[PDB]
Every structure is written in C-alpha cells, then in structure tokens.
C-alpha cells in the first residue's frame, strides 16, 4: 500500500509495516505516534487537497539514535584558514505499523 | 650537471614501466645424443664429448 507521508521536512512512501529511519521526534523511547500527514494509497487515494483528509499512518518509535559522523572541513588557500568540524545527525527509528486511510 | 637535466623525479610507476621489456629470457637447450644432458643447440659440451 504505497502511502506517502511528510515528516521531518521530507516525505516518503510507506509499506505495510517496515523498518524506516526519519528525522528526530519528541516521542517516548518505544511508544507509538501517528502521522496525520498522508498522501495516496494502495488503491489510488488521490490526495485532493494538499494532504488527504480523513486518514493516517501510524508507527512505533522503535528508538532514537545519532548516526555516522560526517566530517565538514573548510580551507582557503594563500590565506591561513582551515576548520575541522565533525557533525552527526540524529534520527528516530520509525517502525511502520498501521496504514489505515 | 650541464644543459640537459631531468625536470622531475620520475614516478616509481613511470619508472618501473620503462623497465617493462627489461626482463630476461631463459636460455635454449636440447638433449644430446650422448648424455641426457642439456646442450645449447649447435654445440659441443663438457662431460659428453662428440663425433667427427
């Protein structure tokens, strides 16, 4: 059931329950959260308005956690200037449960 | 020291490369009538002798 859902500024399709990783959220460790945001479905849930009206995808916040430490580093030539800076983004482990439109 | 002079240290890669055809080639030998010994073609040989 290809149901889209925008969360964390970005939106993605959602299968009938599956492991997914999304932007950080203010949910309990292993609780449940509903994303009223939903677009389309398995049988052509045309999204009239920007977002489908009565409908919702729910998922269990499997857990939080930071990720790979990407390394940003600036440098300008002929001019003593260099900046080493590490940065690792946070992300919640949204395990999809219910996909009821 | 004079006019012609290497402009850059030749990389180890480009170096080894030039030494491509540098490799040796094994001698050519054949069994003799006398001993089973290996003689180079068109030759006599010690510890074997010859005829005519």
């Amino acid at each position: 059931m290809f149901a889209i859902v925008k969360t964390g500024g970005k939106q993605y399709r959602v299968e009938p329950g599956l492991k997914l990783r999304v932007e950080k959220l203010d949910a309990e460790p292993g609780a449940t959260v509903e994303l009223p945001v939903l677009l389309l479905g398995g049988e052509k849930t045309v999204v009239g308005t920007p977002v489908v009206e009565g409908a919702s995808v729910v998922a269990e916040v499997l857990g939080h956690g930071r990720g790979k430490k990407i390394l940003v580093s600036k440098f300008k030539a002929k001019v003593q200037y260099r900046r080493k800076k590490g940065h690792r983004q946070p992300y919640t482990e949204l395990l999809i449960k219910e996909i009821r439109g | 020291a004079k006019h012609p002079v290497p402009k850059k240290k030749t990389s180890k890669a480009r170096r080894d490369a030039r030494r491509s055809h540098h490799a040796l080639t094994p001698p050519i030998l054949v069994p003799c009538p006398e001993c089973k010994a290996m003689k180079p073609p068109h030759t006599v040989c010690p510890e074997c002798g010859y005829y005519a």
Binding site: - | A23, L24, P26, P27, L29, M38, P40
Partner: protein
C-alpha cells in the same frame, strides 16, 4: 613443507640479480639447475649456489626428496651499501654505491 636458504651480504647489485632469480621462480629443481648453468649473467653463479644449498637443506634436514622438489618461491633483498668516494673533474667528489644483496630461495615438495 618448505626448505629455505639465504645468502646475506652478497657483493652484487639487487636489480641485477633479481633478473636471474625471476627466471627460475616456481620452476622444477632440475629445470632451474640447467637455466642457471647456461644463462649468461654474473648473478647466476650466486643464485645457483644458494639454490644448490637450498636443496641440501631440503634433503639433509627436512626429509624431502630431490626428485620431487621445486621453487615454491624466491626473492632477493637489498642489504647495506658500501659508499665510496670518487674523484671527479674540477674537485667535485662523488659517492659511488657498491650495493649488496640478500638472495633468498625456498624449495618445496611438489604434489602427490
């Protein structure tokens, strides 16, 4: 099983002997003996001599059979160099490198 043999401190240039060794690498013992015999190079004599002892060790210390061994692997290594002066025109003095080698040869039982 394998039988080593090493010639340390051989007054001869590595690049030079590498050529000879490269000839015999992974060859039947009797095959090699012949190559070194008629191969035209100074490096032969040294490699042959160490190759030859490599066999003796294979036999008199490792129960191996002469009629069944080969060159599992072999290689020369660069040892210390003898630096020497060299009078050059107009006073310039150049240091010449009489290099040295560490010939290694290792034999092995063929198959079964």
């Amino acid at each position: 099983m394998e039988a080593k043999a090493i010639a340390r401190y051989v007054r001869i240039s590595p690049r030079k002997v590498r050529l000879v060794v490269d000839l015999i690498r992974g060859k039947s013992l009797e095959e090699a003996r012949n190559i070194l015999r008629y191969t035209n190079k100074r490096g032969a004599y040294f490699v042959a001599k160490v190759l030859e002892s490599a066999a003796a060790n294979a036999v008199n210390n490792h129960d191996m059979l002469e009629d069944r061994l080969y060159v599992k692997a072999a290689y020369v290594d660069e040892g210390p160099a003898l630096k020497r002066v060299l009078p050059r025109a107009r006073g310039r003095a150049d240091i010449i490198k009489k290099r040295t080698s560490h010939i290694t040869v290792i034999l092995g039982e063929k198959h079964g």
